[PDB]
Amino acid sequence: XXXXXXXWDNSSPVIVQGGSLRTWSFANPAIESVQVLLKTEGRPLDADVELWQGPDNTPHKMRVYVEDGALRTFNAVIGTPRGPNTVAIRNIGQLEFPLDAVVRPDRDDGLAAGIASVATRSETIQGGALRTYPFNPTVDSVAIILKTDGRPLNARIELLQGPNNNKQVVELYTEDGLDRPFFAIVETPGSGNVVRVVNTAPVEFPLYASVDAYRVGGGGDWADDGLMIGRAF
Amino acid sequence: XXXXXXXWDNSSPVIVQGGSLRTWSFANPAIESVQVLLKTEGRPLDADVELWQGPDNTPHKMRVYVEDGALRTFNAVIGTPRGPNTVAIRNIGQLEFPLDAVVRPDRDDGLAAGIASVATRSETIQGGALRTYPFNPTVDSVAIILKTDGRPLNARIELLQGPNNNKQVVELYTEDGLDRPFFAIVETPGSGNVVRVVNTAPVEFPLYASVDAYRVGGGGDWADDGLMIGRAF
């Protein structure tokens, strides 16, 4: 429904060097959720997104990896239910892989509302199992919602453009899937995009998932069809 | 003097799918240079090789094309003078063209030593000019060294087996030709092999080149000499 590029255009990106950390603070009680956008200047991204509530509480945390931050925009809407919440972005890659970070308060008409509107009836994934969501070349981004009935959430989202060709991996953890649902948009440029949702918790910790098509462009451009010509110089 | 097959047999090749990217890290200062070997299972090769030093500095990059990766092994030696470096091997081909990649530290008595040992006094190519290096059928591989006096190196290397029959194209860039020379071993199976070196820098940007036969078979095997009986089936 909404292009993640537009949101990044009207933002103020902040540079986070490899091995460094930045924090955003949100004390206004009207901030229901925040949206984190992570981009790079072409190189792979390796980040850690954590929600800190008290002195030693981390109810929400992610381990992110993107092969090309310039092409693909990372996105996750994080709930900020109670009290002051500080979001922490930690670039865990080496000095060669800087990233840009935008985390700002969400809105009632923001990404979360669109993700909920596009969502389809969720399906159950048992602990230690996984689900696969093939998407057709017409889809540019997909909305992902992960929920539980009250148990802690331990999942791993993988975007594949091939048999074992991982383009984006998100190892997420939430203390309560019912109270703290996981929202995220995965951009799917190209063709052969397959979303694998892996429930890494033991068998007695099922979760609910719903991966729908979010942004479809309807390109269908076939100018490249024909003889393949190498670089001309 | 040395066969690329001998080294590639004592290595651990890594598959890079079309559109993917693998990276290596060499933080050890004892690593003076790394040799990069790329192959395929008979299908064409199309890869980008880059050296990453800082957050946004790529002082050594290479755009590579090989018509057949099984017959022809791409080889290059990349200098890593200062600090930690990571080599980025990007497969820019389509899904149909996977490549196998080896990048391991070079040694004192490795390829750079051999390429230097076989090298002959270098000649100059003016900016915007080109040079041609024909070779006789007995030579299987040739060693190429490119240098400048300190200015960035912008050169294109081409291998032809006919008038306009490109078999291997390497468009290389370097930030400092004196500090960062280009080393490479280009395989020349068969006959009619001509190595072309084009200086792509502006007219006032000369470079130094040396193209010498590295391995000569001398086997004198001429089994095909005689009746070319069509496939007997």
DSSP string covering chain B: ---HHHHHHTS--EEE-TT-EEEEEE--TT--EEEEEEE-SSS-EEEEEEEE-SSS---EEEEEEES-TTTS-EEEEEE--SS-EEEEEEE-S-TT--EEEEEEE--TTSHHHHHHHH----EEE-TT-EEEEE--TTEEEEEEEEE-SSSPEEEEEEEESSSS-EEEEEEEEES-TTTS-EEEEEE--SS--EEEEEE-S-TT--EEEEEEEEEE------TTSS-------
**What span, in angstroms and rounded, lies between the C-alpha atoms of A57 and A55?**
6
Dihedral of alpha carbons B129, B61, B211, B209, sign: positive
Residue B21: which of A17, A44, A233 has the nearest Cβ? Answer: A44
In this complex, do A190 and B19 lie within 8 Å of one another by their Cβ atoms? yes
User: What does the alpha-carbon distance between residue B179 and residue B200 come to, in Å, rounded to a whole number?
Assistant: 19
Cβ contacts of B45 within 8 Å, gap of 6 or more: B38, B39, B64, B65, B66, B69, B74, B93, B97, B99
DSSP labels for A149-187?
SSS-EEEEEEEESSSS-EEEEEEEEES-TTTS-EEEEEE
Copy the structure tokens of residue A35. 């949206």
Which residues, in sequence order, are bridge partners of residue B103?
Answer: B36
- Identify all chain A residues contacting B56, using CB atoms and an 8 Å cutoff: 41, 98
Closest CB to B20 among A67, A98, A230: A67
Which has the closest alpha carbon to A27: A90, A93, A87, A84? A84
Partner-chain residue, chosen from A96, A161, A165, that has the shortest CB–CB distance to B55: A96
Q: State the smallest CA–CA distance between residue B41 and chain A in angstroms.
A: 18
Q: Give the integer Cα–Cα distance in Å for A72 and A117.
A: 23
Backbone angles phi, psi at B162, to 5 degrees: -160, -170
Phi, psi of A35 (to 5 degrees): -120, 125
Q: Which residues of B touch A167 (CB under 8 A)?
A: 20
Where on the phi/psi map is residue A221: left (φ > 0), alpha (ψ -120 to 50), or beta? Answer: beta
Question: What is the number of other CB atoms lying within 10 angstroms of the CB of residue A120?
Answer: 11
CB contact (8 A) between residue A96 and residue B21: no
Specify the residue for token string 């922490």.
Answer: A88
Any B CB within 8 A of A98 CB: yes
Domains and CATH numbers, chain B: 4-216 (2.60.120.680)
Identify any residues that bridge with B142 across adjacent strands, giving them in sequence order. B186, B213
The structure tokens listed for B161 are 């087996």
C-alpha B49/C-alpha A15 separation (Å) is 26
Q: Do A161 and B19 count as a contact with CB atoms less than 8 A apart?
A: yes
For residue A165, give how far its alpha carbon lies from the nearest alpha carbon of chain B (Å). 7
Cα B143 from Cα B138, distance rounded (Å): 15
Q: What share of chain A is helix, strand, coil (3-state, %, to 5)?
A: 5, 45, 50
> Is residue A7 classed as helix, strand or coil in its secondary structure?
helix
**B83 burial level (CB within 10 Å; 0-12, 13-18, 19+):** exposed
Tally of CB atoms within 10 A around A216: 14
Distances (CA, A) of A35 to A11, A82, A157, A199, B51: 11, 17, 18, 23, 34
Place of tokens 């792509």: B200
Measured CA angle at B84 (ends B113, B49), to 5 deg: 65
Contact (Cβ atoms closer than 8 angstroms) between residue A8 and residue A37: yes
Q: What is the CA radius of gyration of chain A?
A: 18
Distance between CA atoms of residues B94 and B46, nearest Å: 9
Nearest by Cα to A139 from A69, A183, A184, A191 = A191
Q: How many CB atoms are closer than 10 A to CB B226?
A: 7
Is A215:A118 a contact under the CB 8 Å cutoff?
A: no
Task: Identify the DSSP state of A96.
Answer: T
Task: Give B28→chain A minimum CA distance, Å.
Answer: 14
Does the CB of A178 have a partner CB in chain B at under 8 Å? no
Q: Do B54 and A96 touch (CB under 8 A)?
A: yes
Q: CA nearest A153: which of A183, A194, A187, A196?
A: A183
> Which residues on adjacent β-strands are paired with residue A68?
none
Chain A residues closer than 8 Å to B54 by CB: 95-96
Experimental method: cryo-EM
List CB contacts (< 8 A) between A41 and chain B: 56
Length of chain A: 233
Q: What is the dihedral of CA A114, A118, A121, A123, to 10 degrees?
A: -80
B contact test, residue of A94, A96, A233 with most B CBs within 10 A:
A96
Listed in sequence order, the residues at least 6 apart from A179 whose beta carbon sits closer than 8 Å to its beta carbon are: A79, A81
From residue B169, how far is each of A28, B124, B159, B211 by CA, in Å? 59, 20, 7, 15
